[PDB]
Design an enzyme around this catalytic site. Structure first.
Site, mmCIF file in Angstrom:
data_model
loop_
_atom_site.group_PDB
_atom_site.id
_atom_site.type_symbol
_atom_site.label_atom_id
_atom_site.label_comp_id
_atom_site.label_asym_id
_atom_site.label_seq_id
_atom_site.Cartn_x
_atom_site.Cartn_y
_atom_site.Cartn_z
ATOM 1 N N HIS A 68 0.813 -1.211 0.000
ATOM 2 C CA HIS A 68 0.000 0.000 0.000
ATOM 3 C C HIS A 68 0.847 1.261 0.000
ATOM 4 C CE1 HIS A 68 -0.239 -0.341 4.613
ATOM 5 N NE2 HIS A 68 0.004 0.967 4.467
ATOM 6 N N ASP A 117 -0.006 -7.878 1.538
ATOM 7 C CA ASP A 117 0.248 -6.451 1.480
ATOM 8 C C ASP A 117 1.706 -6.221 1.850
ATOM 9 O OD1 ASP A 117 0.172 -3.653 1.433
ATOM 10 O OD2 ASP A 117 -1.424 -3.491 2.940
ATOM 11 N N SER A 192 2.854 1.943 9.047
ATOM 12 C CA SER A 192 2.883 1.075 7.863
ATOM 13 C C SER A 192 4.286 0.520 7.612
ATOM 14 C CB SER A 192 2.540 1.859 6.587
ATOM 15 O OG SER A 192 1.223 2.261 6.565
#
Length: 239
Positions: A68, A117, A192
């Protein structure tokens, strides 16, 4: 109920201002600690004009982060910069880059397909001809399956929204470990790509963000869980 239990566990990390969390739950990584494992494999990622995140160095010019994040570069590797062990100077004026910065050579967006991801970023040696692995040690990969409900581990990364410069360790407690890893713990969006490191210092997963939990109005952290197939692929990559 499950909701009452969930709220009590979540309130431990989110029921007081984050500057009031006890150091056992959330703590700034010092410049001394950043030189050791497992901290020393972790660095700040900057996608010029798009995003901030954390990356973990796994060997042989190679860093993992979330898809992402990496996808926002749109396969333009010069937009991605990594700085391992970046931290604030003593005044919070600047970021000290003890090993300088590395600029990507190649991005592989979805090496494990679009349902996982994580992306693989290959970095250029710096101007001295030095690779990332010439200045820091690789993370020590391991499987997620030794983790279970109730175990604690350490999430390590750059919680940008809280502190734009420094690395922090967030204690995490696992809720479940079959639908990837789900856990309680203090995180912000910048996290993240933060590493999940078990009590033995093995890199056993990659933080993604928050997912819905129990119902549409509640959430929990979740990560990419490292299975045997994923581990084997990454070992062969860094051979």
């Amino acid at each position: 109920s499950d909701l009452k239990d969930h709220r009590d566990k979540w309130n431990k990390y989110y029921g007081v201002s984050p500057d009031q969390l006890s150091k056992d739950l959330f703590d700034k990584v010092s410049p001394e600690q950043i030189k050791n494992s497992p901290y020393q494999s972790v660095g700040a990622l900057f996608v010029k004009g798009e995003a901030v995140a954390t990356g973990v160095f796994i060997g042989k010019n190679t860093v993992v982060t979330n898809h992402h994040i990496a996808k926002e570069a749109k396969n333009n590797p010069s937009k991605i910069i990594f700085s391992p062990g970046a931290h604030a100077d003593e005044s919070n004026t600047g970021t000290v880059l003890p090993h300088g910065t590395f600029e990507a050579s190649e991005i592989i967006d979805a090496p494990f397909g679009t349902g996982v991801d994580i992306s693989v970023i290959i970095f250029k040696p710096n101007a001295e001809g030095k690779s990332i692995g010439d200045v820091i040690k690789a993370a020590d990969l391991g499987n997620s399956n030794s983790l279970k409900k109730g175990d604690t581990a350490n999430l390590i990364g750059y919680p940008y929204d809280f502190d734009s410069k420094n690395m922090y360790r967030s204690q995490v407690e696992f809720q479940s470990t079959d639908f990837g890893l789900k856990y309680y713990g203090y995180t912000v969006p910048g996290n993240s790509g933060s590493g999940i490191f078990n009590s033995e210092g093995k890199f056993v997963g990659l933080h993604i963000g928050k997912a819905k939990h129990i119902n549409s109005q509640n959430e929990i952290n979740y990560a990419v869980s490292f299975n045997d197939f994923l581990i084997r692929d990454l070992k062969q990559l860094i051979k």
